[PDB]
């Protein structure tokens, strides 16, 4: 499914991402916009042989197992194929573990390139939460 901006903001707030480990809600909505364009089915194969899956493009080399990526660690202990649901539960759970590493949200390249340093609060303004 493709979330509407405000729809994802409300869901993400419901899923506890508003001020999770120092990051305001806007960061997460913005990340989803540029990482998957709000699409829970988004999947992109990478140069290093890994693949990113879901609303938050979780990588198969470190976080989920897709069985075709060399040197995988599967930190979120879950098959990448399970992060493609219209239910964002699984992706949020894993994202929280991801952001809990020292790299913070910098792990999300699109967030780093398109959100960090911008007025992220703009992504939740004008929304009924």
């Amino acid at each position, epitope marked *: 499914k493709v979330f509407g901006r405000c729809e994802l903001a409300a869901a993400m707030k419901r899923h506890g991402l*508003d001020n*999770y480990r120092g990051y305001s809600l806007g960061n997460w909505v913005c990340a989803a916009k540029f990482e998957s364009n709000f699409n829970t089915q988004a999947t992109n194969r990478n140069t290093d042989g890994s693949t990113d899956y879901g609303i938050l493009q979780i990588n198969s080399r470190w976080w989920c197992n897709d069985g075709r990526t060399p040197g995988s660690r599967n930190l979120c*202990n879950i098959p990448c194929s399970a992060l493609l649901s219209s239910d964002i539960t699984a992706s949020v*759970n894993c994202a929280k573990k991801i952001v809990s590493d020292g790299n913070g949200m910098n792990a999300w390249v699109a967030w780093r390139n398109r959100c960090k340093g911008t007025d992220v609060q703009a992504w939740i303004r004008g929304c009924r939460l």
Partner: antibody
Amino acid sequence: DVQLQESGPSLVKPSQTLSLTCSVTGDSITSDYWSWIRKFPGNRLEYMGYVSSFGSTFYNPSLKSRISITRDTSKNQYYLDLNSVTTEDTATYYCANWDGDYWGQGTLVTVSA
Amino acid sequence: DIVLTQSPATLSVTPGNSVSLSCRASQSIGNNLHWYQQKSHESPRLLIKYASQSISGIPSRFSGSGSGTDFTLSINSVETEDFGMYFCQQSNSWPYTFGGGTKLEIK
């Protein structure tokens, strides 16, 4: 399946460094985030800190930077170092993964002259 | 740090009856509240993660609800194997903190 187990001295002197080891069986330590939690008398639990798979450490400010958490992949173990201990550090120490699914048996360490 | 307050400190109940334990946070933590059970001579055991998400291997009589600052652990038809301590723990902000615990014992 995964199993954790703490080991180390059960009695230490004030002012010394208290060190504990958590041995992990069932999978590589590089595949998870690892933590240390301790229980004081009176059912008081304190989260000491954790280390991510990439080596990033997070320590509870309550420890006043006297803590160090490290890992040894070849030995599949991770450790806890707590410097300049006092009787206030007597507690039951447990290691567990970040998710809270796997826990050690816990080991009592008493700080006494 | 975030302060977690659990009430009541102790709760006596007769097997078969239902109960609910409270855990309130000094500030909003979204759904980032987890529940642990701890018996004597044993390590804590995760019962519920993220306020209401179930954990495989845990009796289904355990459930959790709440958001923001108020959370609840509910036990449908308490069994004797349930007597012991219950702790809530937040992971919303560093340092992670634990509530003072609620003791469940037979009445």
